Structure 1
Amino acid sequence: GWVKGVMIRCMLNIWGVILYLRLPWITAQAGIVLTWIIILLSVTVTSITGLSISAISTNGKVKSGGTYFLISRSLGPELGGSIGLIFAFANAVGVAMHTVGFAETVRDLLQEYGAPIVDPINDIRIIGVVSVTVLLAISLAGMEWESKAQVLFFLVIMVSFANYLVGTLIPPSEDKASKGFFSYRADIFVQNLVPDWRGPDGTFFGMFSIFFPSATGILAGANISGDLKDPAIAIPKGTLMAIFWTTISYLAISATIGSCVVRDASGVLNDTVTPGWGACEGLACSYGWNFTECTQQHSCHYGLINYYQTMSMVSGFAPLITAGIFGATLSSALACLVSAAKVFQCLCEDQLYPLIGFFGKGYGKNKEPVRGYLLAYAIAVAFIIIAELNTIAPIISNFFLCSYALINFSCFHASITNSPGWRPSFQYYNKWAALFGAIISVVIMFLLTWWAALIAIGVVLFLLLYVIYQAGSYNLALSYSVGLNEVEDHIKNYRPQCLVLTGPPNFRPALVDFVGTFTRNLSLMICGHVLIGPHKQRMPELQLIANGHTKWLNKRKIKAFYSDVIAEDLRRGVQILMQAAGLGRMKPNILVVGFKKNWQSAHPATVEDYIGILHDAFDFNYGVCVMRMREGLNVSKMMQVDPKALVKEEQATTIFQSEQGKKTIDIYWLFDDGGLTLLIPYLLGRKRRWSKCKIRVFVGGQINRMDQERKAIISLLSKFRLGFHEVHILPDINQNPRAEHTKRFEDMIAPFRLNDGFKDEATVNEMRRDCPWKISDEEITKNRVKSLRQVRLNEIVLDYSRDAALIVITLPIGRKGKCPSSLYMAWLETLSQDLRPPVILIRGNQENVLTFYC
Structure 2
Amino acid sequence: GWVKGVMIRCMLNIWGVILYLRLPWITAQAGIVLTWIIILLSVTVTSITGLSISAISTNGKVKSGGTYFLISRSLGPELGGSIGLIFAFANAVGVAMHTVGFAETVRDLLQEYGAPIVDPINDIRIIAVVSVTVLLAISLAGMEWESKAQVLFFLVIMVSFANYLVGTLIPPSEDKASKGFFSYRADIFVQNLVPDWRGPDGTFFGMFSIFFPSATGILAGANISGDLKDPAIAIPKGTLMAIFWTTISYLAISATIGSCVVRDASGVLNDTVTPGWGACEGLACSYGWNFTECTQQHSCHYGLINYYQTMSMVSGFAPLITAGIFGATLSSALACLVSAAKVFQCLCEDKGYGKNKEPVRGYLLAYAIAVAFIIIAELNTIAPIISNFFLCSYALINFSCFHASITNSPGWRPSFQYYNKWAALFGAIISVVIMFLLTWWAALIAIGVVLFLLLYVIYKKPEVNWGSSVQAGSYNLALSYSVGLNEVEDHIKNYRPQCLVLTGPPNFRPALVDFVGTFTRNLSLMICGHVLIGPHKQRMPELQLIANGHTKWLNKRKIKAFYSDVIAEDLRRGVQILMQAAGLGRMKPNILVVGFKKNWQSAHPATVEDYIGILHDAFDFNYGVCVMRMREGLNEQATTIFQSEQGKKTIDIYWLFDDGGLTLLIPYLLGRKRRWSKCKIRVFVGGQINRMDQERKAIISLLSKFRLGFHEVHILPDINQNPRAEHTKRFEDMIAPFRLNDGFKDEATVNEMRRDCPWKISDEEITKNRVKSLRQVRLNEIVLDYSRDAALIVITLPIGRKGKCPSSLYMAWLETLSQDLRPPVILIRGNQENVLTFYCQ
Q: TM-score, normalised by structure 2?
A: 0.64
- Counterpart Cα distance in 2 of 1:693 and 1:651: 28
Q: Is the 8 A contact 1:85 1:347 kept in 2?
A: no
- Say whether the 8 Å CA contact 1:530–1:564 is kept in structure 2: yes
Kept in 1, the 8 Å contact 2:738–2:760? The answer is no
Name the SS of the counterpart of 2:746 in structure 1.
helix
Say which is worse superposed, 336-345 or 97-106, in terms of deviation. Answer: 97-106
CA drift of 1:20 comes to: 0.9
| 1:636-695 residue CA offsets vs partner (Å, 9 max, x unmatched) | xxxxxxxxxxxxxx9999999999999999999999999999999999999999999999
**Secondary structure, aligned partner of 1:841:** strand
Corresponding residue of 1:739 = 725
- Deviations along 1:499-531, one digit per CA (max 9) or x if unpaired, are 775668999999999999999999999774547
Distance of aligned partners of 1:666 and 1:380 in 2 relative to their CA distance in 1, 3 Å threshold: closer
CA distance in structure 1 between the partners assigned to 2:424 and 2:744 by the alignment? 84
- Between 210-219 and 820-829, the greater mean CA deviation after superposition: 820-829
Q: 1:647: which partner in 2?
A: none
Partner of 1:44: 44
d(CA) in 2 for partners of 1:431, 1:710? 80
Deviation track 1:323-377 (CA, whole Å, cap 9, x = no partner) reads: 4423421321221232233333333456xxxxxxxxxx56554455556556655
Asked if the contact 1:78/1:468 (under 8 Å) is kept, the reply is: yes
Which segment drifts farther, 233-242 or 371-380?
371-380
Does the aligned pair in 2 maintain the 1:63–1:225 contact within 8 Å?
no
* Partners of 2:742 and 2:762 within 8 A in 1: no
- Identify if the C-alpha distance between structure 1 residues 386 and 852 changes in structure 2 by more than 3 Å, giving closer, same or farther: closer
Moved more, 77-86 or 242-251: 77-86
**Deviations, residues 766-796 of structure 1 (Å, cap 9, x unaligned):** 9899999974368637776996899999999
Structure 1 residue 295 displacement after superposition: 1.8
**Distance of 2:800 and 2:330 partners within structure 1:** 94
Name structure 2 gaps, 5 residues minimum: 460-470
Aligned partners of 1:794 and 1:831 also within 8 Å: yes
Residues 50, 222 of structure 2: 8 Å contact kept: no
409, 419, 425: which one aligns with 1:429: 419
Alignment RMSD: 8.8
CA distance in 2, matches of 1:580, 1:544: 23
Mean Cα deviation higher: 128-137 or 390-399: 128-137
SS at 1:126 equivalent:
helix
Counterparts in 2 of 1:710 and 1:402: CA distance versus 1, 3 Å: farther
Q: Is the 8 A contact 1:117 1:123 kept in 2?
A: yes
Does 101-110 or 289-298 show the bigger shift?
101-110
Q: Does 1:848 align with 2:834?
A: yes
Provide, for residues 381-417 of structure 1, a one-character-per-residue CA deviation record: whole Å limited to 9, x for no partner. Answer: 6655545433443444455445545655766787788
Conservation of the 8 A alpha-carbon contact between 2:688 and 2:716: no
Q: State the SS of the aligned residue for 1:42.
A: helix
CA gap 1:769/1:180 in 2 versus in 1, 3 angstroms: closer
Greater CA drift, 366-375 or 323-332:
366-375
Measured after TM superposition, the shift of residue 144 of structure 1 is: 1.6
Report the Cα offset of residue 21 of structure 1.
Answer: 1.3
Structure 1 position 32, deviation (Å): 3.5
Do the aligned partners of residues 523 and 734 (structure 1) sit closer, same or farther apart at CA in structure 2, a change above 3 Å counting?
farther
- Counterparts of 2:694 and 2:415, CA distance in 1: 68
Which SS does the other structure have where 2:60 is aligned?
A: coil
Contact 1:495/1:852 (8 A) holds in 2: no
Distance change (3 Å), C-alpha of 1:259 and 1:595: farther
Distance 1:86 1:620, change over 3 A: closer
Q: CA deviation at 1:26?
A: 1.1
- In structure 1, how many angstroms separate the alpha carbons of the residues matched to 2:60 and 2:700? 60
Contact 1:2 1:237 in 2 (8 A): no
Distance 1:16 1:798, change over 3 A: farther
Q: Which residue of 1 aligns with 2:553?
A: 552
Match of 1:658 in 2: 644
Work out whether residues 10 and 242 of structure 1, in 8 Å CA contact, stay in contact via their aligned partners in 2: no
Deviating more after overlay: 192-201 vs 479-488? 479-488
> Is contact 2:5–2:217 with CA below 8 Å preserved after alignment?
no
Give the conservation status (yes or no) of the 8 Å contact 2:595–2:627.
yes
- Answer yes or no: is the 8 Å Cα contact 1:65–1:222 preserved in 2: no
The alpha-carbon distance between structure 1 residues 489 and 106, as it changes in their structure 2 partners (threshold 3 A), is closer
Give the Cα–Cα distance (whole angstroms) in 1 for the partners of residues 93 and 670 of structure 2. Answer: 63
* Correspondence for 2:396: 406
| 1:719–1:337 Cα change, 3 Å | same
Q: In structure 1, what is the equivalent of residue 382 of structure 2?
A: 392
- Please report how far the alpha carbon of residue 451 of structure 1 lies from its aligned counterpart in structure 2 after TM superposition: 7.4
Change (3 A) 1:471 1:560: closer
Change (3 A) 1:772 1:320: closer
Distance in 1 between residues matched to 2:821 and 2:699, nearest whole Å: 32
Q: Deviations over 1:420-468 (max 9, x none)?
A: 7777655666788768767876776676667766876687577667744
Could you tell me how far apart the structure 2 residues matched to 1:474 and 1:8 are? 49
Q: Show CA shifts across 1:180-228 (max 9, x none).
A: 3344555434433444331344343443443332112544455566643
Change (3 A) 1:752 1:183: farther
Give how far 1:150 is off.
2.4
Choose 465-474 or 394-403, whichever is displaced more. Answer: 465-474
Pairs within 5 Å for 1:85-484: 87-112=87-112, 121=121, 124=124, 128=128, 132=132, 135=135, 139-165=139-165, 173-177=173-177, 179-223=179-223, 227-231=227-231, 233-270=233-270, 274-276=274-276, 282=282, 284-285=284-285, 289-315=289-315, 318=318, 321-349=321-349, 364-367=354-357, 376=366, 386-401=376-391, 403-404=393-394, 407=397, 467-468=457-458
* 1:165–1:587 distance in 2 versus 1, CA, 3 Å: same
The alignment partner of 2:834 has SS state of: coil
Structure 1 residues 382 and 697: CA distance shift in structure 2, 3 A: closer
Q: Confirm or deny: 8 A CA contact 1:66 1:222 kept in the other structure.
A: no
Q: Closer, same or farther in 2 for the Cα pair 1:739/1:189, shift >3 Å?
A: farther
Instruction: Kindly state the Cα deviation for residue 24 of structure 1 after the two structures are TM-superposed.
Output: 1.0
**Following the alignment from structure 2 to structure 1, what is the Cα–Cα distance between the partners of residues 86 and 565?**
51
Q: 2-side partners of 1:570 and 1:242: how far apart?
A: 80
1:300 Cα deviation from its structure 2 partner: 1.1
> Aligned in 2, Cα 1:524/1:344: closer, same or farther, shift over 3 Å?
closer
State the shift of 1:25 in Å: 0.8
CA distance 1:622–1:283, change in 2 (3 Å): same
Q: Deviations over 1:258-316 (max 9, x none)?
A: 35434323354545685449865656558865443422221112222122222344456
Instruction: Check 1:239–1:653 CA distance in 2 against 1; reply closer, same or farther (3 A cut).
Output: farther
Pairwise CA distance, 1:710: 31
Q: Contact 1:10–1:221 at 8 Å: present in 2 too?
A: no
Structure 1 gap segments, 5+ residues each: 351-360, 635-649
Q: Is the 8 Å Cα contact of residues 17 and 328 (structure 2) preserved in structure 1?
A: yes
Pair 1:539–1:92, CA change in 2 (3 A): same
Q: Distance in 2 between matches of 1:764 and 1:654?
A: 48
Aligned to 1:625: 626
The equivalent of 1:695 in structure 2 is 681
**Contact 1:655–1:661 (CA under 8 A) maintained in structure 2:** no
Q: CA deviation at 1:574?
A: 1.4
Contact residue 12 and residue 19 of structure 2 kept, 8 A: no
Q: Distance in 1 between matches of 2:835 and 2:371?
A: 75
Q: Quick check: 1:100–1:387 contact (8 Å CA) kept in 2?
A: yes
Indicate the larger mover: 680-689 or 405-414: 680-689
Verify the 8 A CA contact 1:492 1:851 in the aligned structure 2. Answer: yes
Q: 2: CA distance between counterparts of 1:87 and 1:771?
A: 82
Deviations 1:555-575 (A, max 9, x none): 999999763346786334314
* CA distance 1:828–1:419, change in 2 (3 Å): farther
Q: Distance in 1 between matches of 2:763 and 2:114?
A: 126
Distance 1:657 1:224, change over 3 A: farther
Measured in 1, the distance between the counterparts of 2:689 and 2:411 equals 68
In 1, the alpha carbon distance for the partners of 2:744 and 2:269 equals 131
What CA deviation, in whole Å up to 9, does each residue of 1:102-155 have, x standing for no partner?
Answer: 444444544556866665556655655565566556553244233333233333
The farther-off stretch of 206-215 and 15-24 is 206-215
Note if contact 1:163-1:316 (Cα within 8 Å) is conserved in structure 2: yes
SS at structure 2 position matched to 1:616: helix
SS class of match (1:627) = strand
| Residue correspondence of structure 1 range 387-786 to structure 2 within 5 A | 387-401=377-391, 403-404=393-394, 407=397, 467-468=457-458, 501=502, 528-530=529-531, 563-565=564-566, 570-578=571-579, 581=582, 607-614=608-615, 746-750=732-736, 775-776=761-762, 780=766
3-state secondary structure, aligned to 1:124: helix
Q: Is the 8 A contact 2:180 2:266 kept in 1?
A: yes
